[PDB]
Amino acid sequence: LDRADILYNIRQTSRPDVIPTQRDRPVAVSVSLKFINILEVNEITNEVDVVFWQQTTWSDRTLAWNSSHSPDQVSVPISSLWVPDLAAYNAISKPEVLTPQLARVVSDGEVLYMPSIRQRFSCDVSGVDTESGATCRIKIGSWTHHSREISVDPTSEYFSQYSRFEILDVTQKKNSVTYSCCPEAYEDVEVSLNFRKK
Amino acid sequence: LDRADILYNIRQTSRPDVIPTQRDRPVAVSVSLKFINILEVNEITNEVDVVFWQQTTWSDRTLAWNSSHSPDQVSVPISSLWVPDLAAYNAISKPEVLTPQLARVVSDGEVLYMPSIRQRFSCDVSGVDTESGATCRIKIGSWTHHSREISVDPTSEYFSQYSRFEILDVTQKKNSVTYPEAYEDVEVSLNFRKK
Amino acid sequence: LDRADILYNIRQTSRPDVIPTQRDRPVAVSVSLKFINILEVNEITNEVDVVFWQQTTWSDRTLAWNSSHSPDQVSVPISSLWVPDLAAYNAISKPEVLTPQLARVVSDGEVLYMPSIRQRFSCDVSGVDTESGATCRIKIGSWTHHSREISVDPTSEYFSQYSRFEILDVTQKKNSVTYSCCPEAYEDVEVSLNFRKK
Amino acid sequence: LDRADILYNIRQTSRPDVIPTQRDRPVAVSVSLKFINILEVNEITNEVDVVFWQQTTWSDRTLAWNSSHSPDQVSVPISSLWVPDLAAYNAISKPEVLTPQLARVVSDGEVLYMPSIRQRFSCDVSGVDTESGATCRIKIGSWTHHSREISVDPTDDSEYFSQYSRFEILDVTQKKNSVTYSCCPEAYEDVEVSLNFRKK
Amino acid sequence: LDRADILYNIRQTSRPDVIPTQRDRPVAVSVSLKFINILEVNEITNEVDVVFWQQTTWSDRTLAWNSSHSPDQVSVPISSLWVPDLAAYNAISKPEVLTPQLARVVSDGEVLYMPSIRQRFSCDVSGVDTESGATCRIKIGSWTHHSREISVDPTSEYFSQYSRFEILDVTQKKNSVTYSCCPEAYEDVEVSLNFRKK
Numbered sequence: 011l012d013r014a015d016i017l018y019n020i021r022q023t024s025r026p027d028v029i030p031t032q033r034d035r036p037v038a039v040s041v042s043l044k045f046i047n048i049l050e051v052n053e054i055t056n057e058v059d060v061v062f063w064q065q066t067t068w069s070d071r072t073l074a075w076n077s078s079h080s081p082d083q084v085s086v087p088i089s090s091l092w093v094p095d096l097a098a099y100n101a102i103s104k105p106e107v108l109t110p111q112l113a114r115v116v117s118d119g120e121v122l123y124m125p126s127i128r129q130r131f132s133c134d135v136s137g138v139d140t141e142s143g144a145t146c147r148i149k150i151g152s153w154t155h156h157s158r159e160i161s162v163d164p165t166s167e168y169f170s171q172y173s174r175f176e177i178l179d180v181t182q183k184k185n186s187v188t189y190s191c192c193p194e195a196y197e198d199v200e201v202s203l204n205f206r207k208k
Numbered sequence: 209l210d211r212a213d214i215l216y217n218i219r220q221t222s223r224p225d226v227i228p229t230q231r232d233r234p235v236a237v238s239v240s241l242k243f244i245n246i247l248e249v250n251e252i253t254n255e256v257d258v259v260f261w262q263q264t265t266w267s268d269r270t271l272a273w274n275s276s277h278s279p280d281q282v283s284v285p286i287s288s289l290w291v292p293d294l295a296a297y298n299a300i301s302k303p304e305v306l307t308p309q310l311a312r313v314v315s316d317g318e319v320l321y322m323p324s325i326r327q328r329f330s331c332d333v334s335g336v337d338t339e340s341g342a343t344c345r346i347k348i349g350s351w352t353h354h355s356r357e358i359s360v361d362p363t364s365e366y367f368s369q370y371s372r373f374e375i376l377d378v379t380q381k382k383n384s385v386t387y388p389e390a391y392e393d394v395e396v397s398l399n400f401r402k403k
Numbered sequence: 404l405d406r407a408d409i410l411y412n413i414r415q416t417s418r419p420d421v422i423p424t425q426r427d428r429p430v431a432v433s434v435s436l437k438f439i440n441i442l443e444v445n446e447i448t449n450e451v452d453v454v455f456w457q458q459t460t461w462s463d464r465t466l467a468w469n470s471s472h473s474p475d476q477v478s479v480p481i482s483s484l485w486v487p488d489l490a491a492y493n494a495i496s497k498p499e500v501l502t503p504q505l506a507r508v509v510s511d512g513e514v515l516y517m518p519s520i521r522q523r524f525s526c527d528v529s530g531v532d533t534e535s536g537a538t539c540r541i542k543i544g545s546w547t548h549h550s551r552e553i554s555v556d557p558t559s560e561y562f563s564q565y566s567r568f569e570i571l572d573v574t575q576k577k578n579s580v581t582y583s584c585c586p587e588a589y590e591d592v593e594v595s596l597n598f599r600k601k
Numbered sequence: 602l603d604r605a606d607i608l609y610n611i612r613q614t615s616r617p618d619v620i621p622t623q624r625d626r627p628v629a630v631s632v633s634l635k636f637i638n639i640l641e642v643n644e645i646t647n648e649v650d651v652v653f654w655q656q657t658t659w660s661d662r663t664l665a666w667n668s669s670h671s672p673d674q675v676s677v678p679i680s681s682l683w684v685p686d687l688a689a690y691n692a693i694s695k696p697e698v699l700t701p702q703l704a705r706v707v708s709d710g711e712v713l714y715m716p717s718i719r720q721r722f723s724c725d726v727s728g729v730d731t732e733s734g735a736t737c738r739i740k741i742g743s744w745t746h747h748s749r750e751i752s753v754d755p756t757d758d759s760e761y762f763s764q765y766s767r768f769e770i771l772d773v774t775q776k777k778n779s780v781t782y783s784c785c786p787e788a789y790e791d792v793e794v795s796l797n798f799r800k801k
Numbered sequence: 802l803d804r805a806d807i808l809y810n811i812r813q814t815s816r817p818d819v820i821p822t823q824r825d826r827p828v829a830v831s832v833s834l835k836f837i838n839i840l841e842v843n844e845i846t847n848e849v850d851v852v853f854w855q856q857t858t859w860s861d862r863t864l865a866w867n868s869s870h871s872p873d874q875v876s877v878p879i880s881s882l883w884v885p886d887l888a889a890y891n892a893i894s895k896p897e898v899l900t901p902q903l904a905r906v907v908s909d910g911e912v913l914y915m916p917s918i919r920q921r922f923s924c925d926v927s928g929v930d931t932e933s934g935a936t937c938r939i940k941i942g943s944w945t946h947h948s949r950e951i952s953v954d955p956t957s958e959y960f961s962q963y964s965r966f967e968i969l970d971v972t973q974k975k976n977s978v979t980y981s982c983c984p985e986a987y988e989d990v991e992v993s994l995n996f997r998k999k
C-alpha cells in the first residue's frame with residue numbers, strides 16, 4: 011500500500027454523511043481550543059473576536075488499513091471524511107476557517123482535524139481591564155446528534171505575544187444536562203477563557 | 209437497516225427539487241423562531257441585527273423507512289432533502305447560517321431543520337429605550353409556493369444573558385393573504401428593550 | 404403528469420445556456436422593480452443602497468407541458484432554467500440575492516423570476532432632503548444580448564413603512580441604446596426613483 | 602445549425618484549460634479598460650476604488666463554425682471557454698465581477714469578454730485635488746503565460762464614465778510594456794493604463 | 802505532444818490529494834515571499850495588512866513528459882495538481898488570493914505556484930515610526946505534513962513605490978520544531994520584514 015492507494019480507497023468508500031458509530035455506542039469526539047489571538051473586544055456589547063485552533067479528534071474504523079509496509083498516516087480532505095457537526099452555541103458569526111481543510115488520518119482510524127478559526131462570540135467581557143480579568147465562556151457541542159450518537163470531551167502556549175491581551179487561565183469542562191422533554195443527555199464542552207488587557 | 213443504508217437510500221432517491229405534496233394537500237410546515245441574541249439596533253434607521261434558531265418542521269414521507277431493528281433517526285445534509293423555500297419578507301441582508309447544514313429525519317418521515325441564523329431586518333425599533341419596549345415584527349413565508357402547496361403555522365428561553373437587550377414578549381401568529389391564490393406567512397412579534 | 408415528472412423532464416431537457424428564441428424573434432423579457440427599502444444614502448458620494456424585488460418575467464416554450472390532469476405550475480431552481488443576463492448598468496456592488504433562487508413556471512412556458520435584491524447604485528442623490536426629493540435612475544438591460552435576441556420592457560406599494568425615506572414617484576421607461584464600439588443596439592429599462600427623507 | 606447545436610458542441614469540446622495557441626504563436630489578447638466610476642480615493646494611503654469594463658478580445662479557432670444558415674454569434678458562459686489569466690499587478694483587492702459571466706463568441710472564433718469589475722488599486726493619488734489631477738497607473742498582464750504564449754495589446758475616455766461621480770477624467774492613455782527578468786529567459790507583456798483624474 | 806494532450810493527461814491522471822513523495826523522502830518545497838505592499842498597520846493592536854507574492858516551488862515527477870517536440874512548460878489550474886498545505890501560523894485572516902489560480906509546470910515535473918495574496922497578520926509593529934523600523938515576523942509551514950513528508954526551505958524589489966511604508970530589510974530563515982505530543986519535526990520558514998513609515 012502507498013499513499014495513492016490509501017487515499018483512493020478512502021475516497022471511494024468513506025461515507026461523509028454517515029456517523030461512524032461503532033456498536034451503537036456514541037462516537038467519542040475530543041475537543042480542545044488552543045487560543046492564538048484575541049483580536050477585538052467590546053465591554054459594552056459583550057462581544058469578542060477570537061482566533062483559535064480547534065483540536066478535534068475521533069475514530070472512524072472504516073478508514074483503517076494495514077500499515078505493515080505502508081504509511082502510518084495520510085492527510086485527507088475533510089470533504090472525503092465524516093466530521094462531527096460541532097457548533098459554538100454562543101457564536102455570532104460564521105466560523106472563518108483560516109487553514110487548509112485537511113484532516114490527519116492514522117492507519118487505525120484515528121482522525122485529527124485541527125482548523126484555525128476566527129469567530130465572534132457573545133460572552134462576558136466585564137472586567138477585561140481589571141487585573142482579575144474577564145472570563146469569556148464558549149460552549150461547543152454537536153448541533154444535531156445527542157449523547158448516544160456523539161459524546162464530547164475535553165483533553166495559552168501558542169498565544170500571540172503581540173496581542174493587546176494576555177491569558178490568565180483556560181479551563182475546559184464538560185456539561186451533561188438531562189431535560190424533561192427528552193430522555194437523552196445533551197453534551198457540550200464549556201471553555202472558560204480568563205483574559206485581560208495588558 | 210443501519211445508518212449507512214438509510215443515508216444511502218435517502219441520497220439515491222430523494223428529490224430535493226420536489227415538494228413532498230401528499231395528495232394535493234399542502235405540506236404542513238411549522239415555523240418557530242427562538243431568539244438567541246439582539247446584536248445591533250438602530251432607532252433612527254429602524255434596523256435590527258438578530259440571531260435566532262429557526263425551528264422548521266414538516267413531514268416528507270418519501271424519506272420514511274421501517275425502523276424495526278434500525279435507527280429511529282438520522283442526521284441528513286439538507287442538500288439531499290427537499291426544504292421549504294422560506295423567506296423573511298422584511299429581511300435586508302442574506303440569512304447568514306451559523307451552524308452545520310444538517311436536518312434531523314425520523315423514520316416516519318418527520319423532518320426537523322433548525323439552523324442558527326444571523327440576519328438584519330427592517331422593523332419598528334421605536335421605543336427600544338422606553339421600558340414598554342420596541343416591537344419588531346418579522347414575517348416568514350414560502351417565497352414561491354401558495355397555501356395549497358405549503359401551509360405555514362406557528363408552534364425567550366435560549367436568549368443570551370449577555371445581550372444589551374432583553375425580551376419582554378414574543379408572540380407568533382399566522383396570516384393568509386390573497387392578492388387567485390392565498391399566500392400564508394407567520395408573523396413573529398418581538399417585544400424587546402434595552403437593559 | 405405529477406410535479407415529480409414535470410421537474411424531472413425540465414431538468415433532463417432544459418438548456419440553461421440556450422436563449423429560448425422562438426423564430427429568430429427576440430425573447431420578450433419584462434422587468435419591473437418593486438422597491439422595498441432605501442437603506443443607505445450619501446448625497447456627497449451620490450450612492451444609494453436599495454432593496455427591491457426584481458419582477459422578471461418571460462416565455463420559454465420548451466418548458467411547456469400538457470396540464471390536462473396535471474399541476475398548472477411548478478417552482479423550479481433557476482440553475483435548471485435559461486435566465487436573462489440582466490445587469491444594472493450603474494450598479495457598484497454585486498447584486499446580493501436575499502431569497503430562494505427559484506422561478507415559477509407555468510405549463511404554457513411562462514416563467515416568473517422575482518428575487519429580492521440588495522444592491523448599491525451610482526445615481527443622483529441631490530435633493531434628498533428637499534421635499535421635492537431626489538430622483539435616482541437605474542438602468543437594467545441584457546449584458547450580452549442585443550435587441551433582436553432580447554427585448555426588455557416595463558410592466559411603492561410593498562415599500563417599508565419603517566424606512567427613513569419615502570417614495571414620491573416611480574416611473575419606468577424603455578430606451579434603445581447603441582454604443583460606439585458596436586453596430587448593434589441594446590435595449591434597457593430606465594427606472595426613475597423619486598424619493599426623499601421623511 | 603441553431604444556437605442549441607452550437608452551444609452543445611462548444612460545451613462538449615472547447616477545453617477551458619487549453620490556451621488556443623495557433624501554430625506556436627502567442628494568442629493575441631487585446632485589453633482595454635473603459636472607466637465607469639471612481640468611488641473612493643485616499644491620497645494618504647494612495648489607494649483607489651474603481652469600477653471599469655474590461656474589454657477583452659482574442660481568437661480561438663476551435664470555437665469556430667460554418668455560419669451559412671446559422672447564427673453569426675452566441676453568448677457562452679466563460680466556464681466553457683478558455684480565458685486569458687489576466688491580472689492587475691497593483692491590485693489590492695479581489696476583482697469583484699458585477700455582471701453575468703458570459704462571453705460573446707463569433708462564428709470565426711473571435712471572442713469578446715467584457716466584465717464590469719470593481720477593484721481596489723495601489724497607485725499614485727497625489728494631486729487629485731490639484732486641477733492638474735492625479736495619475737493612477739494600472740498594469741494588466743498574463744499571470745503565468747509569457748510573451749510567446751500570450752501577447753497583450755491596447756486597442757472617448759469619459760465616454761461611459763458616470764456623470765454622478767465625485768471625480769472626472771482628464772485623460773486615459775494605454776501603452777504596452779514588455780519585461781524580461783533575470784531569473785527566466787522570457788518576456789512578460791503587460792498593458793499599462795494611465796488614468797488622469799481629479800475631484801470636481 | 803501538444804498543450805492539449807499534456808493538459809489532458811495531467812488532468813486525467815494526476816492526483817491532487819496525493820503528496821508526490823518520491824522514495825519516502827520529503828517533498829522539497831521552496832517558499833519565498835516577495836512583498837508588494839504594506840497596506841494597513843496598527844501599532845496598538847500589533848496587526849498588519851500585507852500584499853505579497855508567495856513564490857512556491859517543488860517537484861512532482863508524476864507530471865513529467867518527454868518534451869522532445871513538445872512544449873517545455875504549461876499553465877495548469879491548481880485544482881488539477883497536488884499543492885503544499887502551507888499556512889501562515891500567525892495569520893488572522895483568510896488568505897485572499899488576488900490572481901488566477903494557475904501553476905506553471907515544467908516537463909521535468911518542476912512546479913511553480915506564485916499567487917498574489919492579501920492577508921492580515923499578528924506581529925510586532927512596535928517601532929514602525931522609529932527610523933530603525935518595525936520587524937514583523939511571518940512563519941509559513943505545512944499545516945498537516947511533518948518534515949519527512951514535506952520540507953520547507955527559503956530561496957524588496959517588487960515593492961510598491963506608492964506605499965506609505967518602505968522596506969529596510971527582509972530575511973528568510975528556516976526553523977525545525979519537535980513537540981512533546983508527537984515524535985516528529987515540523988519545519989517552517991520564518992520571514993522577517995523590517996519596515997518603517999516614510
Ligand SMILES: N#Cc1cccc(-c2nc(-c3cccnc3)no2)c1
Nearest residue numbers: 297349351352391506507515516517
Ligand atoms: N406565483 C408566484 C410567485 C413567484 C415568484 C415570487 C413570488 C412572490 N411572492 C412574493 C410575496 C410577497 C409577500 C407575501 N407573499 C408573497 N413576492 O414574490 C410569487
Ligand SMILES: *[C@@H]1O[C@H](CO)[C@@H](O)[C@H](O)[C@H]1NC(C)=O
Nearest residue numbers: 802865866867868869870871
Ligand atoms: C522522447 O520521445 C522520442 C520519440 O517520440 C525520442 O526521440 C526521445 O528519445 C524520447 N525520449 C524519452 C526520455 O524517452
